[PDB]
PDB file of C-alpha atoms in Angstrom:
ATOM      1  CA  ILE A 574      -8.457 -46.037 -40.468  1.00 55.73           C
ATOM      2  CA  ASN A 575      -7.758 -43.083 -42.755  1.00 58.44           C
ATOM      3  CA  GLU A 576     -11.274 -41.673 -42.381  1.00 58.60           C
ATOM      4  CA  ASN A 577     -11.244 -41.963 -38.591  1.00 59.21           C
ATOM      5  CA  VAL A 578      -7.649 -40.743 -38.298  1.00 59.20           C
ATOM      6  CA  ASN A 579      -8.467 -37.628 -40.319  1.00 55.65           C
ATOM      7  CA  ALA A 580     -11.580 -37.028 -38.213  1.00 54.50           C
ATOM      8  CA  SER A 581      -9.502 -37.267 -35.034  1.00 56.00           C
ATOM      9  CA  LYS A 582      -6.962 -34.850 -36.496  1.00 58.38           C
ATOM     10  CA  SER A 583      -9.757 -32.413 -37.342  1.00 60.36           C
ATOM     11  CA  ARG A 584     -11.069 -32.354 -33.776  1.00 57.13           C
ATOM     12  CA  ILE A 585      -7.550 -31.496 -32.576  1.00 57.97           C
ATOM     13  CA  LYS A 586      -6.114 -29.300 -35.337  1.00 59.78           C
ATOM     14  CA  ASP A 587      -8.588 -27.697 -37.746  1.00 60.28           C
ATOM     15  CA  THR A 588     -10.490 -24.634 -36.580  1.00 57.55           C
ATOM     16  CA  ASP A 589     -14.192 -24.361 -35.793  1.00 55.51           C
ATOM     17  CA  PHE A 590     -15.240 -21.439 -37.974  1.00 55.48           C
ATOM     18  CA  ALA A 591     -18.408 -20.928 -35.912  1.00 56.40           C
ATOM     19  CA  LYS A 592     -16.472 -20.402 -32.671  1.00 55.35           C
ATOM     20  CA  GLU A 593     -13.452 -18.633 -34.170  1.00 57.65           C
ATOM     21  CA  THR A 594     -15.518 -16.034 -36.021  1.00 56.99           C
ATOM     22  CA  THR A 595     -17.373 -15.324 -32.779  1.00 56.78           C
ATOM     23  CA  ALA A 596     -14.042 -14.961 -30.973  1.00 56.54           C
ATOM     24  CA  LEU A 597     -12.825 -12.584 -33.681  1.00 57.99           C
ATOM     25  CA  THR A 598     -15.877 -10.328 -33.473  1.00 56.57           C
ATOM     26  CA  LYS A 599     -15.668 -10.234 -29.678  1.00 58.50           C
ATOM     27  CA  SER A 600     -12.028  -9.170 -29.949  1.00 57.15           C
ATOM     28  CA  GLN A 601     -12.999  -6.476 -32.454  1.00 59.58           C
ATOM     29  CA  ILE A 602     -15.651  -4.913 -30.214  1.00 61.12           C
ATOM     30  CA  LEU A 603     -13.338  -5.126 -27.206  1.00 61.31           C
ATOM     31  CA  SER A 604     -10.681  -3.352 -29.269  1.00 59.62           C
ATOM     32  CA  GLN A 605     -13.097  -0.534 -30.126  1.00 59.56           C
ATOM     33  CA  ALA A 606     -14.299  -0.241 -26.527  1.00 63.35           C
ATOM     34  CA  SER A 607     -10.738   0.037 -25.233  1.00 62.77           C
ATOM     35  CA  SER A 608      -9.922   2.540 -27.980  1.00 60.43           C
ATOM     36  CA  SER A 609     -12.935   4.687 -27.092  1.00 57.69           C
ATOM     37  CA  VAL A 610     -12.139   4.620 -23.372  1.00 57.63           C
ATOM     38  CA  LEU A 611      -8.536   5.430 -24.269  1.00 59.01           C
ATOM     39  CA  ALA A 612      -9.738   8.486 -26.189  1.00 59.38           C
ATOM     40  CA  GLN A 613     -11.613   9.810 -23.153  1.00 61.45           C
ATOM     41  CA  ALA A 614      -8.731   8.963 -20.820  1.00 60.76           C
ATOM     42  CA  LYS A 615      -6.361  11.103 -22.891  1.00 60.39           C
ATOM     43  CA  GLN A 616      -8.578  14.099 -22.091  1.00 59.57           C
ATOM     44  CA  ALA A 617      -8.423  13.460 -18.335  1.00 58.40           C
ATOM     45  CA  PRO A 618      -5.393  15.754 -17.769  1.00 58.63           C
ATOM     46  CA  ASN A 619      -7.249  18.569 -19.546  1.00 58.09           C
ATOM     47  CA  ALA A 620      -9.205  19.010 -16.314  1.00 59.89           C
ATOM     48  CA  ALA A 621      -6.024  20.378 -14.736  1.00 61.41           C
ATOM     49  CA  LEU A 622      -5.892  23.150 -17.339  1.00 63.70           C
ATOM     50  CA  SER A 623      -9.371  24.344 -16.353  1.00 62.20           C
ATOM     51  CA  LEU A 624      -7.948  24.968 -12.858  1.00 64.59           C
ATOM     52  CA  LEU A 625      -6.193  28.101 -14.187  1.00 65.45           C
ATOM     53  CA  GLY A 626      -2.865  26.328 -13.820  1.00 64.13           C
TER      54      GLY A 626
ATOM     55  CA  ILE B 966       3.497  -4.101 -11.987  1.00 61.90           C
ATOM     56  CA  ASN B 967       4.282  -1.226 -14.346  1.00 60.18           C
ATOM     57  CA  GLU B 968       0.840   0.312 -13.851  1.00 60.47           C
ATOM     58  CA  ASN B 969       0.740  -0.055 -10.068  1.00 57.75           C
ATOM     59  CA  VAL B 970       4.314   1.233  -9.829  1.00 55.58           C
ATOM     60  CA  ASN B 971       3.345   4.274 -11.896  1.00 54.80           C
ATOM     61  CA  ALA B 972       0.272   4.935  -9.754  1.00 52.88           C
ATOM     62  CA  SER B 973       2.369   4.713  -6.588  1.00 54.56           C
ATOM     63  CA  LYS B 974       4.925   7.059  -8.136  1.00 58.61           C
ATOM     64  CA  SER B 975       2.181   9.540  -9.022  1.00 58.64           C
ATOM     65  CA  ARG B 976       0.833   9.559  -5.468  1.00 57.33           C
ATOM     66  CA  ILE B 977       4.313  10.341  -4.118  1.00 59.72           C
ATOM     67  CA  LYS B 978       5.710  12.599  -6.849  1.00 57.15           C
ATOM     68  CA  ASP B 979       3.127  14.091  -9.213  1.00 56.26           C
ATOM     69  CA  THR B 980       1.492  17.350  -8.181  1.00 55.24           C
ATOM     70  CA  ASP B 981      -2.217  17.637  -7.451  1.00 54.42           C
ATOM     71  CA  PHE B 982      -3.238  20.489  -9.739  1.00 52.46           C
ATOM     72  CA  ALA B 983      -6.422  21.055  -7.723  1.00 54.04           C
ATOM     73  CA  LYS B 984      -4.571  21.437  -4.413  1.00 53.81           C
ATOM     74  CA  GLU B 985      -1.586  23.288  -5.876  1.00 56.33           C
ATOM     75  CA  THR B 986      -3.622  25.895  -7.750  1.00 57.47           C
ATOM     76  CA  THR B 987      -5.435  26.622  -4.488  1.00 53.98           C
ATOM     77  CA  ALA B 988      -2.077  27.033  -2.743  1.00 53.67           C
ATOM     78  CA  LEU B 989      -0.875  29.365  -5.497  1.00 53.09           C
ATOM     79  CA  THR B 990      -3.970  31.566  -5.332  1.00 50.46           C
ATOM     80  CA  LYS B 991      -3.781  31.746  -1.537  1.00 50.83           C
ATOM     81  CA  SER B 992      -0.162  32.864  -1.856  1.00 51.50           C
ATOM     82  CA  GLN B 993      -1.109  35.561  -4.370  1.00 53.97           C
ATOM     83  CA  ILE B 994      -3.790  36.997  -2.088  1.00 53.37           C
ATOM     84  CA  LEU B 995      -1.471  36.863   0.925  1.00 55.00           C
ATOM     85  CA  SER B 996       1.187  38.649  -1.125  1.00 53.98           C
ATOM     86  CA  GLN B 997      -1.256  41.426  -2.022  1.00 52.10           C
ATOM     87  CA  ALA B 998      -2.411  41.673   1.596  1.00 52.32           C
ATOM     88  CA  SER B 999       1.154  41.911   2.891  1.00 53.34           C
ATOM     89  CA  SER B1000       2.098  44.450   0.220  1.00 54.49           C
ATOM     90  CA  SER B1001      -0.929  46.580   1.089  1.00 54.55           C
ATOM     91  CA  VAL B1002      -0.167  46.505   4.813  1.00 56.24           C
ATOM     92  CA  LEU B1003       3.429  47.403   3.986  1.00 58.48           C
ATOM     93  CA  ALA B1004       2.255  50.446   2.027  1.00 55.91           C
ATOM     94  CA  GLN B1005       0.198  51.693   4.977  1.00 55.55           C
ATOM     95  CA  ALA B1006       3.201  50.864   7.166  1.00 55.40           C
ATOM     96  CA  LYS B1007       5.556  53.162   5.246  1.00 52.68           C
ATOM     97  CA  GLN B1008       3.282  56.140   5.959  1.00 53.28           C
ATOM     98  CA  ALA B1009       3.278  55.506   9.719  1.00 56.25           C
ATOM     99  CA  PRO B1010       6.396  57.650  10.393  1.00 59.70           C
ATOM    100  CA  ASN B1011       4.791  60.533   8.481  1.00 62.19           C
ATOM    101  CA  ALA B1012       2.740  61.158  11.627  1.00 58.27           C
ATOM    102  CA  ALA B1013       5.898  62.497  13.274  1.00 56.75           C
ATOM    103  CA  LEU B1014       6.104  65.207  10.610  1.00 59.30           C
ATOM    104  CA  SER B1015       2.577  66.262  11.598  1.00 60.43           C
ATOM    105  CA  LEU B1016       3.967  67.105  15.065  1.00 62.05           C
ATOM    106  CA  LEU B1017       5.819  70.159  13.696  1.00 63.30           C
ATOM    107  CA  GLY B1018       9.104  68.289  14.016  1.00 62.32           C
TER     108      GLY B1018
END
């Protein structure tokens, strides 16, 4: 009962390192993509300066 | 809600630098055109002096 109880607890509680590492890397790339788009969005108002105003 | 409220505020309150710079330039040209016509207007009465009077 201890073997099976621990196995049940693992399916519920312990992490799946194969799926969690994939989720981490996806969150990293998404962070860099949002940071890059944020960098270009900061330069959007610069267009108004080119209007001689 | 914060983003859509800020976009709505921009549409109602923030200035369009493309449309406003065009309105500023048009005003500058119209000011130069009115000033020029005024200059030629000041010399209109000088014609009376040309009538030996």
